[PDB]
Ligand binder design. Sequence first.
Ligand SMILES: *[C@@H]1O[C@H](CO[C@@H]2O[C@@H](C)[C@@H](O)[C@@H](O)[C@@H]2O)[C@@H](O[C@@H]2O[C@H](CO)[C@@H](O)[C@H](O)[C@H]2NC(C)=O)[C@H](O)[C@H]1NC(C)=O
Ligand SMILES: *[C@@H]1O[C@H](CO[C@@H]2O[C@@H](C)[C@@H](O)[C@@H](O)[C@@H]2O)[C@@H](O[C@@H]2O[C@H](CO)[C@@H](O)[C@H](O)[C@H]2NC(C)=O)[C@H](O)[C@H]1NC(C)=O
Ligand SMILES: *[C@@H]1O[C@H](CO[C@@H]2O[C@@H](C)[C@@H](O)[C@@H](O)[C@@H]2O)[C@@H](O[C@@H]2O[C@H](CO)[C@@H](O)[C@H](O)[C@H]2NC(C)=O)[C@H](O)[C@H]1NC(C)=O
Ligand SMILES: O=C(Nc1ccccc1)O[C@H]1CCC[N@H+](C2Cc3ccccc3C2)C1
Ligand SMILES: *[C@@H]1O[C@H](CO[C@@H]2O[C@@H](C)[C@@H](O)[C@@H](O)[C@@H]2O)[C@@H](O)[C@H](O)[C@H]1NC(C)=O
Ligand SMILES: *[C@@H]1O[C@H](CO)[C@@H](O)[C@H](O)[C@H]1NC(C)=O
Ligand SMILES: *[C@@H]1O[C@H](CO)[C@@H](O)[C@H](O)[C@H]1NC(C)=O
Length: 526
Amino acid sequence: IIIATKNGKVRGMQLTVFGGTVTAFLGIPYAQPPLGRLRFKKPQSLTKWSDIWNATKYANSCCQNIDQSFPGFHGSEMWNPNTDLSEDCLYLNVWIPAPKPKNATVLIWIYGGGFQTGTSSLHVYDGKFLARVERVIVVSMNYRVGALGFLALPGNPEAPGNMGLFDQQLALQWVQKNIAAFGGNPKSVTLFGESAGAASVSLHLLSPGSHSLFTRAILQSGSFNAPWAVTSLYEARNRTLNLAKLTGCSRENETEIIKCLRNKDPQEILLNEAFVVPYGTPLSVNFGPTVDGDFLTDMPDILLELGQFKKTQILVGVNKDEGTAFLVYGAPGFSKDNNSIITRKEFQEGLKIFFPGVSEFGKESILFHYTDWVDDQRPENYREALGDVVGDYNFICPALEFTKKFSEWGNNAFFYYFEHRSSKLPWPEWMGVMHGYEIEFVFGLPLERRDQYTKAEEILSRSIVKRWANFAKYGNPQETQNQSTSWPVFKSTEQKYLTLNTESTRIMTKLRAQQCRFWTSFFPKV
Ligand SMILES: *[C@@H]1O[C@H](CO[C@@H]2O[C@@H](C)[C@@H](O)[C@@H](O)[C@@H]2O)[C@@H](O[C@@H]2O[C@H](CO)[C@@H](O)[C@H](O)[C@H]2NC(C)=O)[C@H](O)[C@H]1NC(C)=O
Ligand SMILES: *[C@@H]1O[C@H](CO[C@@H]2O[C@@H](C)[C@@H](O)[C@@H](O)[C@@H]2O)[C@@H](O[C@@H]2O[C@H](CO)[C@@H](O)[C@H](O)[C@H]2NC(C)=O)[C@H](O)[C@H]1NC(C)=O
Ligand SMILES: *[C@@H]1O[C@H](CO[C@@H]2O[C@@H](C)[C@@H](O)[C@@H](O)[C@@H]2O)[C@@H](O[C@@H]2O[C@H](CO)[C@@H](O)[C@H](O)[C@H]2NC(C)=O)[C@H](O)[C@H]1NC(C)=O
Ligand SMILES: O=C(Nc1ccccc1)O[C@H]1CCC[N@H+](C2Cc3ccccc3C2)C1
Ligand SMILES: *[C@@H]1O[C@H](CO[C@@H]2O[C@@H](C)[C@@H](O)[C@@H](O)[C@@H]2O)[C@@H](O)[C@H](O)[C@H]1NC(C)=O
Ligand SMILES: *[C@@H]1O[C@H](CO)[C@@H](O)[C@H](O)[C@H]1NC(C)=O
Ligand SMILES: *[C@@H]1O[C@H](CO)[C@@H](O)[C@H](O)[C@H]1NC(C)=O
């Protein structure tokens, strides 16, 4: 139950899973707590300890604003931190199979949450099912989010930006130096993540300091080229200064602004993050990745376009209804508690909420592309169009474009289209196959026959788990035994992708081709 790591010994705990055993190491620190002088700076190396570190419970989650929009509602509160918030949050978790493996492929999870929220201790990120069922080792880490993680004064090591990305990177580094002691193969490391985590994974494909820290990559519902994923240097500065004046920390020296921001309490910095932008959206990322010239050497669209990234296999995909969850966080006429049949003027009003700084002509162009109906008497027409607008613009089309352009440089790519709505899903049926609700299938929670999934869901989760682990171990997301559809590689010409569902798993081509031509060629110009 004790493992000697390069900075000290850690005690784990035993878990009984599906009539077996998994060894969990919860809450191992991987960096100096970024407190006091260290707030806003890159993570610093952790010095040795002599005792046994008791890694027997999830550590603190990083400071963050909570989603309070639906108190008592499991659909929202399942994403809120299930652990004490604190600035002292740089910890990671390790699940290893029992008995101890000899050279196990490692899966590293990076959670999302708009780069402002999230925590590896969530129930839907529990890595014990994967370790039990597929004998991979699962690693997950907490990284700084919001201004405490991504405040940018470009060039200034007091607040250089991308700290949360560097938190992740130091964690990857920790797996490089230590995972063999747990029986993992540091040469067989697959990053996977969802939404902002997925975008984080894609930026590690771009960052040279990460190229030697992982083998392969899996991108669930996110990528760096998404419109929400990279903050400009203009707006980062404007946001850093609006935070300064909002707290009385306006100075001229710039480094003395950071020193001033370092003596505010975490709460005061969190309360003011909301207002650093004049007009926010349900997809706002007040403080996110920037081109810091350190983690990220150039604007990522250029690096993607010009082949500047780690050459390796990727697994990419999206969910059928990425956009719906955001509609009841601001769009008029929408509610999780009715069927949100909205009118044309409500739709038009919704676009003003999702596209605030966009010209009247840009908003008309969106209306025009999404409102020539196959049948113009359906009352749901505007309700579904707005969800598709948000999903296509923010998730599906950028993921497709990332995959096309990444595969143009000769690496195998696999694209999925997840379209199963979970039987237990707390949100209403009109929200469909929502953002983030493939995650529990990936982590194998339906394999738990107790907690209420249908048997079809167990089968779907069991195949996805196999496909993910085969992708991590061997670079190829096939299920070779049960007579399963082969998953073809995604090539920029055919654009074949795989649908995942409980009924018929099928090979399809050119997902949302009409919508994505509008978003990826036309709309970037308006
Ligand atoms: C770190 O853990 C050790 C041991 O953990 C406990 O013992 C395991 C066998 C398991 O049953 C866990 O769930 C337990 O929580 C701690 O050790 C003991 O320390 C107490 C001090 O009050 C001592 O009285 C006991 O005799 C020790 N042994 C046992 C078996 O309880 C140790 O204190 C922990 N370290 C820290 C810093 O909390
Ligand atoms: C760049 O920042 C200025 C400053 O902004 C404001 O102050 C912050 C502390 C915060 O409370 C924001 O909500 C404020 O708006 C932005 O300027 C203002 O713009 C709004 C409407 O656009 C206007 O009502 C304010 O009076 C303006 N204030 C000033 C001092 O100019 C500006 O919009 C930001 N740039 C961009 C591109 O959004
Ligand atoms: C669906 O509900 C929205 C939200 O209204 C709220 O939630 C409801 C479940 C109910 O408890 C209401 O009392 C709440 O106000 C409805 O939107 C409101 O619609 C009215 C009339 O159209 C309008 O005056 C309000 O401004 C709207 N409020 C918001 C926040 O948008 C909507 O009409 C409902 N639609 C259907 C088809 O039932
Ligand atoms: O993540 C975000 N922003 C965000 C997400 C993706 C891309 C860009 C920005 O903010 C958090 C906190 C505020 C509430 N939102 C909603 C959105 C959503 C989506 C799926 C499940 C639950 C929820 C709650 C989550
Ligand atoms: C562990 O294995 C190492 C080689 O790793 C392999 O190649 C990578 C790319 C993965 O795909 C993985 O499946 C392969 O096993 C050896 O160099 C190393 O010596 C081995 N060590 C032990 C202790 O088994
Ligand atoms: C800004 O303040 C820092 C911190 O004391 C100092 O080292 C630096 O020289 C100052 N620069 C200017 C231009 O005032
Ligand atoms: C294949 O089908 C059998 C049904 O007996 C099931 O037990 C097994 O888990 C399935 N394997 C995969 C990888 O889906």
